[PDB]
């Protein structure tokens, strides 16, 4: 795995010693090269995970996420070039280093074999994210958003730390392989119930769950474009990955303890999508759509059926790409109009046609237009829930309807109607912005061709 | 104060602590504590100020009461055992009294009250000495008597220390008072594992010493005692305030910084002893410490407060004083988590 | 110089002599005090310090070449003369900058006295800068809060130093001051109001001269008397050294003072008291931009000796 | 309340200095090179070559192997009359049922 980790580390000295005119260029080049190298990990075995060493391993769950992170870094740099263009060289290098550190941490999280190592790194991801949000945010709510995000995540994580150490003391090892081979069923004792809660709540906080999702709107809206990209593309999937890993030692208590969270998420998807319907901020709308799409994954993980897990992995990858793209488009519009009010800018389709096409394709992916991987994951989760209970189809179909409604509503309000007259600073789309949108869309549509790669280890 | 005299007084404080850590006789340990107090009062009042005099008086009163109770406990143990060695105390009442006295010397709540006041009154150098070096001797005595320490009493004091430190730190604006309350909380963390594993207490003590050294030295380098005075630092020296941000995050304990090591190992040892509720509450309450650390980091470096016109003149001149240890202390207090297996060396 | 040197035996009192004396020449605007101060220094062998200017700190550091006003001072005396009631706060900002410059000057002078042993003659001092601020407040040029902040800054800084042994006051009447200013030719000086000069004179004679008289001798001289430098020097020589707190000081206190004056940042530590007055307060964006500009200046990016851009070499082994 | 610079005017459109901008930086040459780097590595390499690499990625999921083994097993099962799939994933002989 060091074939990916070591170059990622070597990015930092390069960025620090790169010329002020070559910082972005060098970073983008070598980040793309690192993504190319990470592509090799997709060759997962049929049964055994790719155990590179005692500390790092990968499976058909970890590899897509690793590729996603290594691919997301260059696009984040490209997006960050615009607003961080009047910054001093040292601070620009600092931002690049924060992004690189975040990518390195995420790689190690997705490859860590030891559960406590995963906890350490997955909670280490907070520091770069917090710094990015609080320092390079544009509004005054950035400080409160960072506080909310950090405190939510820590309040979830600390009981998880206690529980993990308890497991290490009792079982003797926290290695995923040993934990899976030496799995022992949990009883219904209150101690086991609280252990299950401690092991689940942290990941429930990580991937916004209705009731504990209050941090996400603030974080996504206040954070800079790159920060929002990671927040909505990988940092949320951290919760899903950790939950799928930790559910191995949380059975059969999951059957009894899932009902609260299952109902919370099944109603939360509807609630959040309805909230999207009546939103005035573009980034807030995108964030709430993310909340709903992640609630789908939460349901899938809780049900613990093989189809559910496959759909969960596919949905995670698809949502990462789509949400990052949506935030990038909103960022371009925001940079041009210097406001996040959705109704402020209207009829942008006339002024910017190609960006409007990008908007259309992104919204289509958001509403899970067949045969996009978004639809593949959503349909798999829907079928798994239908097997769990036939009544689920009601809420699932209603959520699909509301998602389509609010996505098309966003497209109509922004990229349709009479153009706003006073807004005269809408210049033609830059090549960089179009390239960013293309590098978000094309991989997803290509992934639809060979979904087996992103269908998880249960394929 | 003449520099030779000051060096002699500092060496006397160190010698008192060394005697406490070197002696095998209870009387000599008490003598070492008395020497520490005697040589500490003038150091606290090196810069003659009414606030400094008040701080010295309060410190003397508290430490004197602690020494009285300590000697009383020693005498009771002598009465019921005829022993002077620093071993298992053979009288429970003497054990309780000695625990109270040593906690008062440390500053564990509910004997925490004097710590913020004295810390605010004294200078940054005196504050550094008070919050780092003065914590060694009582902790050493506690470590030697850990077997006899009543777990219930010590755990109650430690948990209350953590809670009260967090709460007090939330309300403070003066940097010294924030540091003092954080010190109270960290001492609670240190003493929580004292009945279970002393080596973990030593580890936490060392990490705390490094972190507090780094923080106090950065404050001295920036010559700031309030949140706004520290806020002005970004204009002159951004490096100092950014490193302060890093150290504050470590003090909060957020991984992968050094501050995670002590909390991680403490939770490990407490869970090994079948205690799960206590460490969970400890971490959840340390979140408050993290909160006030984050507020300070916000004001210092994460955000930029307005500056003054006179800062331009200060820009031209460069700091003459050079604290040699500061870089190494910053490194050791930020990036040492990959080095936990070195815990064995402490044993 | 440090604690070690004092331990080694370096004692300031050994170097200090009867000649070693801080003499401050004060007066109203264009009183010719500078000429008399130079004459006193020459005829006493003391080191004369030219009156602290806006770019005094620029002279002390770097290459001595005055830096840009936007980068060093952000205040104009000429603007104050033209518009004394500007909405930019130039009046109080200028006064505070002048006080900081004079605080640095006094420290620079004391350091010279405690290292070389040679006496110092200074044109006014911190103990005298209050006169101009009081005059501005009387004229209504500055607001009361500015005066309050100036008092705050002074009380936390000036106390650490020792008042001058000799206070020479060149008493020139306001009409003669006006005549000289008209002869001077400077249009900004010509714009100076007579009431401002009268306020300066009143502040001097009613506050400064009595308070200094309590501390030490105040050799008040008329313009004609000041012309006779020999008499002025003689009178200073015949002043009892008992006047002033210096006879009450010793090697320990002198060591403290010498350590204080060496660290210029410590000297100016309280000049940036975190009181947010609109006149002095500089916004974060402007602060960052100006500091970045200052750092770009050659010789300011790195510590002295490590700025290769100026010609420093061997940095790899420095 | 504070002497601060007036809000910076709307970000200068990079088209203003150079009509051919491509975004990225301000220097036209570095803009050209940044666009070349992003397009070449981003589209020509990863998106094309890596897609081909993952397209012809050797089958280590044992899909074809599974199908071939299933074919062999079906042949044997039908030839010997054995049921195509048994009712026990493990032999009952080695299961010491309580």
């Amino acid at each position: 795995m060091l074939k990916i980790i070591i170059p990622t580390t070597m990015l930092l000295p390069m960025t620090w010693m790169s010329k002020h005119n070559m910082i972005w260029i060098n970073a983008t080049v070598h980040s793309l090269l690192i993504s190319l190298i990470s592509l090799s990990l997709l060759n997962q075995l049929g049964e055994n995970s790719l155990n590179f060493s005692l500390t790092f391993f990968s499976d058909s769950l970890s590899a897509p996420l690793l590729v996603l992170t290594t691919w997301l870094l260059p696009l984040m740099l490209m997006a960050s070039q615009s607003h961080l263009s009047k910054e001093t060289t040292t601070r620009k290098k600092l931002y690049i280093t924060m992004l690189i550190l975040l990518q390195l941490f995420l790689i190690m999280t997705f490859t860590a074999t030891e559960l406590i190592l995963f906890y350490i790194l997955f909670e280490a991801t907070l520091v770069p994210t917090l710094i990015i949000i609080t320092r390079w945010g544009n509004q005054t709510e950035r400080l409160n958003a960072g506080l909310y995000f950090l405190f939510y995540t820590l309040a979830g994580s600390l009981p998880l730390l206690v529980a993990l150490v308890y497991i290490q003391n009792t079982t003797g090892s926290l290695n995923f392989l040993i934990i899976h081979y030496w799995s022992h069923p949990l009883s219904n004792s209150w101690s086991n119930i609280f252990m299950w809660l401690a092991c689940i709540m942290a990941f429930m906080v990580k991937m916004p769950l209705y009731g504990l999702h209050l941090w996400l709107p603030k974080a996504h809206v206040e954070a800079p474009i790159a920060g929002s990209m990671v927040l909505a593309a990988v940092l949320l999937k951290l919760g899903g990955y950790g939950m799928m890993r930790i559910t191995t030692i949380l059975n059969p208590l999951t059957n009894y303890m899932a009902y609260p969270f299952l109902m919370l998420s099944m109603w939360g998807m509807i609630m959040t999508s309805s909230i999207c319907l009546r939103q005035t901020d573009l980034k807030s709308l995108i964030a709430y759509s993310s909340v709903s799409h992640m609630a789908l994954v939460i349901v899938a993980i809780m049900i613990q059926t093989p189809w559910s897990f496959m759909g969960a992995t596919a949905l995670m990858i698809a949502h990462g790409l789509t949400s990052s793209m949506l935030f990038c488009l909103a960022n371009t519009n925001y940079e041009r109009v210097h406001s996040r009010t959705m109704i402020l800018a209207r009829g942008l389709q006339t002024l910017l046609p190609l960006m409007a096409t990008w908007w259309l394709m992104a919204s289509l992916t958001n509403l899970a237009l067949p045969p996009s991987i978004n639809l593949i994951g959503e349909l798999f989760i829907i079928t798994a829930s239908f097997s769990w209970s036939n009544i689920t189809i009601i809420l699932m179909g209603m959520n699909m309807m509301i998602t389509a409604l609010y996505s098309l509503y966003m497209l109509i309000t922004t990229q349709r109607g009479k153009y706003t007259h006073h807004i005269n600073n809408i210049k033609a789309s830059f090549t960089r912005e179009n390239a960013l949108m293309a590098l978000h869309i094309l991989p997803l549509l290509l992934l639809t061709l060979n979904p087996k790669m992103i269908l998880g280890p249960l394929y | 104060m003449n520099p030779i005299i000051y060096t002699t007084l500092i060496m006397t404080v160190m010698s008192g602590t060394m005697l406490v850590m070197i002696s095998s006789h209870w009387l000599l340990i008490w003598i070492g504590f008395e020497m520490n107090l005697l040589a500490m009062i003038p150091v606290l009042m090196k810069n003659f100020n009414p606030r400094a005099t008040e701080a010295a008086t309060k410190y003397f009163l508290t430490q004197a009461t602690a020494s009285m109770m300590l000697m009383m406990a020693i005498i009771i143990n002598l009465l019921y055992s005829g022993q002077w060695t620093i071993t298992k105390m053979f009288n429970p009442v003497a054990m309780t009294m000695m625990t109270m006295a040593l906690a008062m010397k440390l500053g564990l709540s509910p004997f925490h009250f004097w710590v913020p006041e004295v810390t605010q009154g004294i200078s940054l150098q005196a504050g550094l000495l008070l919050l780092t070096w003065q914590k060694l001797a009582p902790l050493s005595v506690l470590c030697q008597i850990s077997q006899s320490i009543n777990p219930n009493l010590m755990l109650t004091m430690a948990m209350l220390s953590i809670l009260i430190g967090g709460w007090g730190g939330l309300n403070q604006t003066q940097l010294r008072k924030i540091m003092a309350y954080s010190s109270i909380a960290h001492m609670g963390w240190m003493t929580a594992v004292l009945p279970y594993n002393t080596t973990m207490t030593i580890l936490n003590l060392l990490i705390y010493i490094t972190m507090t050294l780094a923080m106090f030295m950065l404050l001295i380098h920036s010559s700031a005692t309030t949140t706004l005075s520290l806020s002005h630092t970004w204009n002159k020296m951004p490096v100092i305030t950014s490193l302060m941000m890093v150290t504050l995050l470590s003090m909060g304990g957020l991984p992968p910084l050094s501050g995670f090591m002590p909390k991680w190992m403490i939770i490990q040892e407490m869970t090994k002893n079948e205690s799960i509720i206590m460490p969970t509450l400890m971490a959840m309450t340390a979140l408050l410490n993290l909160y006030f650390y984050m507020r300070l980091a916000y004001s210092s470096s994460l955000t930029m407060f307005p500056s003054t016109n006179n800062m331009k003149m200060k820009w031209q001149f460069e700091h003459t004083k050079q604290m040699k240890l500061l870089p190494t202390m910053i490194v050791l207090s930020t990036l040492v988590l990959p080095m936990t297996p070195a815990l064995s060396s402490l044993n | 110089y440090g604690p070690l040197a004092f331990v080694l035996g370096e004692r300031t009192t050994r170097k200090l002599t009867e000649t070693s004396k801080v003499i401050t020449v004060d007066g109203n605007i264009c009183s010719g005090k500078g000429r008399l101060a130079r004459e006193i220094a020459e005829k006493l062998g003391l080191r004369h310090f030219p009156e602290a200017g806006i770019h005094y700190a620029d002279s002390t550091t770097g290459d001595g070449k005055p830096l840009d006003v936007q980068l060093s001072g952000n205040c104009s005396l000429e603007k104050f003369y033209d518009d004394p009631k500007s909405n930019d706060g130039n009046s109080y900002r200028l006064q505070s900058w002048l006080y900081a410059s004079r605080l640095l000057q006094y420290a620079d002078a004391l350091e010279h006295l405690l290292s070389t042993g040679q006496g110092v003659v200074l044109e006014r001092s911190i103990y005298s800068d209050f006169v101009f601020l009081e005059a501005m407040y009387r004229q209504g040029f500055i607001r009361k809060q500015c005066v309050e902040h100036y008092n705050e800054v002074k009380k936390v800084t000036a106390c650490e130093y020792l008042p001058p042994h000799v206070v020479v006051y060149v008493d020139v009447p306001v009409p003669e001051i006006q005549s000289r200013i008209q002869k001077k030719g400077n249009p900004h000086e010509m714009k100076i109001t007579a009431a401002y000069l009268q306020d300066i004179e009143n502040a001097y004679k009613k506050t400064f001269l009595p308070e200094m008289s309590e501390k030490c001798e105040v050799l008040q001289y008329s313009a004609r008397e000041a012309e006779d430098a020999e008499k002025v020097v003689e009178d200073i020589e015949y002043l009892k050294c008992d006047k002033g707190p210096w006879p009450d000081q010793d090697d320990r206190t002198f060591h403290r003072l010498r350590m204080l004056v060496q660290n210029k940042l410590e000297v100016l530590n309280y000049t940036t008291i975190p009181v947010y007055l609109p006149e002095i307060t500089i916004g974060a964006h402007q602060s960052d931009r100006v500091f970045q500009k200052f750092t770009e200046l050659p010789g300011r990016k790195y510590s002295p000796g490590y700025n290769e851009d100026v010609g420093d070499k061997w940095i790899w082994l420095k | 309340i504070r002497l601060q610079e007036d809000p910076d005017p709307e970000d200068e459109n990079l088209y203003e200095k150079n009509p051919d901008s491509h975004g990225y930086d301000k220097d036209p040459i570095v803009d050209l090179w940044n666009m070349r780097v992003v397009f070449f590595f981003g589209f020509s390499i990863v998106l094309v070559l890596g897609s081909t690499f993952v397209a012809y990625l050797p089958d280590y999921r044992m899909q074809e192997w599974a199908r071939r083994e299933a074919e062999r097993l079906v042949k044997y099962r039908e030839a010997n009359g054995l049921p195509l799939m048994e009712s026990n994933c493990f032999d009952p002989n080695k299961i010491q049922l309580p």
Binding site: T140 | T173, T227, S299, P306 | P278, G283, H285 | R2, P7
Partner: peptide, 14 residues
């Protein structure tokens, strides 16, 4: 077109 940076009022709360 500038990130919000604390004014005098924000610092005064501290």
């Amino acid at each position: 077109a500038r990130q919000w940076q604390p004014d005098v009022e924000w610092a005064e709360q501290f």
